[PDB]
Design a binder for these strands. Structure first.
Ligand code: XG4
Ligand code: CA
Ligand code: K
Length: 430
DNA sequence: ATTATGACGCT
DNA sequence: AGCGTCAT
């Protein structure tokens, strides 16, 4: 009743760049703009692997993880841009730099959490309080929300999608109580005004378009962001959650797309998020553990407490390369040469990070996969990272992995290595 | 032979 | 500390 907290205390947005790597390449090369196009890494094996797809190309069925040769079967006029290669490997520097552009613009409006190379959470609670004091109880015009969808509207008592969007927005706005400066729906609406401004700034100052979700927590903001891509933003109110969740497959919610979500489905015999409401918190905890159970109990009611961390920079800086099938590394010289290539990219990125961001990594994590192991990592060993020197780092990585070499002959490497991964972690201010 | 990462939980 | 999960 009056004591049942509703998780409406914060305004949180999730901003995600549309087809990011594609937009980066389309900005650089105007010939790619407004075309079916994709970004690929490598080329020799089946045309390279696609990692980003323009919405025009998505209409033909082109997806991430598909081989370019197969994508061209679906879309023969598909245009392709390849990731840069340096020291024998993919080099994603261009996209990391573009990410910094976007992240710095977002940081002007509020503290952000960098969730991935092209998406960030935004805690707008305080900014919304400020804008509400400025408005002085003035209603919010639809002209202030020109790309916003209100999830679940229109409802009740009309042919084209922009007309739909506007009807829903008008129903939402006419129902607003702009008198109460503590109304959560009003707070979300003002948050959406601010996100319109942030998205306008990103597009004006970088050329990049993005989608966004506005809700009361990170999971709902993320789900909202996905509802109307590309180049649009969606407000998911607390009140919209029962209908939204009533037909939402469990796997669509961030963190439930894997084994845990499959176990929720199998153990409880349910399919949709909303079905979780019928279980007690203790029941959920008994199946899925304390933390998961409390989280599911709150989440299926639209409530989640995970804070937006004030973290604009990545916590780790890593370099990895797969050596699949017959390219696997089977000689000591091979393993040393590739460890050195990775360590050289790592040194470059670390040196630039230290100059930009006034910090130094102190731990080097070395991960490998051996042939036949289906796991991502077959082995992970750490050592100290005392100097940004590639030869040092690569020699140290070899020292921590060399006992994995089954071969008695210290010139061969068996079983051959199908992945190498160097990761700098545990940063300290410098 | 979806690849190159990046986050975070568990013990 | 090393491993597993999730993500994409
Ligand atoms: N190296 C690599 N990069 C990847 C991979 N997957 C994605 N990226 C890169 C390429 C992506 O551009 C970028 C951001 O990932 P998303 O947000 O998941 N996809 P996008 O922004 O393209 O589409 P949407 O409009 O649906 O948000 O990360 C991968 O497996 N490997
Ligand atoms: Ca994106
Ligand atoms: K993303």
């Amino acid at each position: 009743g009056p004591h049942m907290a509703t998780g409406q205390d914060r305004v949180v947005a999730l901003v995600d760049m549309d087809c990011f790597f594609v937009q980066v390449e389309q900005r650089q090369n105007p010939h790619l703009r407004n075309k079916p196009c994709a970004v690929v890494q490598y080329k020799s094996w089946k045309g390279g692997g696609i990692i980003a797809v323009s919405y025009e190309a998505r209409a033909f069925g082109v997806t991430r993880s598909m081989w370019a040769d197969d994508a061209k079967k679906l879309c023969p006029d598909l245009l392709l841009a390849q990731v840069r290669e340096s020291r024998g490997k993919a080099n994603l520097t261009k996209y990391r730099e573009a990410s910094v552009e976007v992240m710095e613009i977002m940081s002007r409006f509020a503290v952000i959490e960098r969730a991935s190379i092209d998406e960030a959470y935004v805690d707008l609670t305080s900014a919304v309080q400020e804008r509400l004091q400025k408005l002085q109880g003035q209603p919010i015009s639809a002209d202030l929300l020109p790309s916003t969808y209100i999830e679940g509207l229109p409802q009740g008592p009309t042919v084209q999608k922009e007309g739909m969007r506007k009807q829903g927005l008008f129903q939402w706005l006419d129902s607003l109580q702009i008198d109460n400066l503590t109304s959560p729906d009003l707070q979300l609406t003002v948050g959406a005004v601010i996100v319109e401004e942030m998205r306008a700034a990103i597009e004006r100052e970088t050329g990049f378009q993005c989608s966004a979700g506005i809700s009361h927590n990170k999971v709902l903001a993320k789900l909202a962001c996905g509802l109307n891509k590309p180049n649009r933003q969606t407000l998911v109110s607390h009140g919209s959650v029962p209908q939204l969740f009533s037909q939402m497959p469990i796997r669509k919610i961030r963190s439930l797309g894997g084994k845990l979500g499959a176990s929720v489905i199998e153990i409880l015999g349910i399919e949709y998020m909303g079905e979780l409401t019928q279980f007690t918190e203790s029941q959920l905890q008994s199946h899925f553990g304390e933390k998961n159970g409390s989280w599911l109990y709150a989440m299926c009611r639209g409530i989640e407490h995970d804070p937006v961390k004030p973290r604009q920079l990545p916590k780790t800086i890593g370099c990895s390369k797969n050596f699949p099938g017959k390219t696997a590394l089977a000689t000591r010289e091979q393993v040393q040469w590739w460890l050195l290539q990775l360590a050289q990219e790592l040194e470059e990125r670390l040196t630039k990070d230290r100059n930009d961001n006034d910090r130094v990594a102190t731990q080097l994590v070395v991960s490998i996969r051996v042939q036949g192991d289906k796991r991502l990592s077959s082995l992970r060993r750490c050592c100290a990272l005392t100097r940004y020197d590639a030869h040092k780092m690569s020699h140290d990585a070899f020292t921590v992995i060399k006992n994995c070499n089954t071969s008695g002959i210290q010139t061969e490497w068996s079983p051959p290595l199908t992945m190498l991964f160097l990761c700098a972690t545990k940063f300290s201010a410098s």
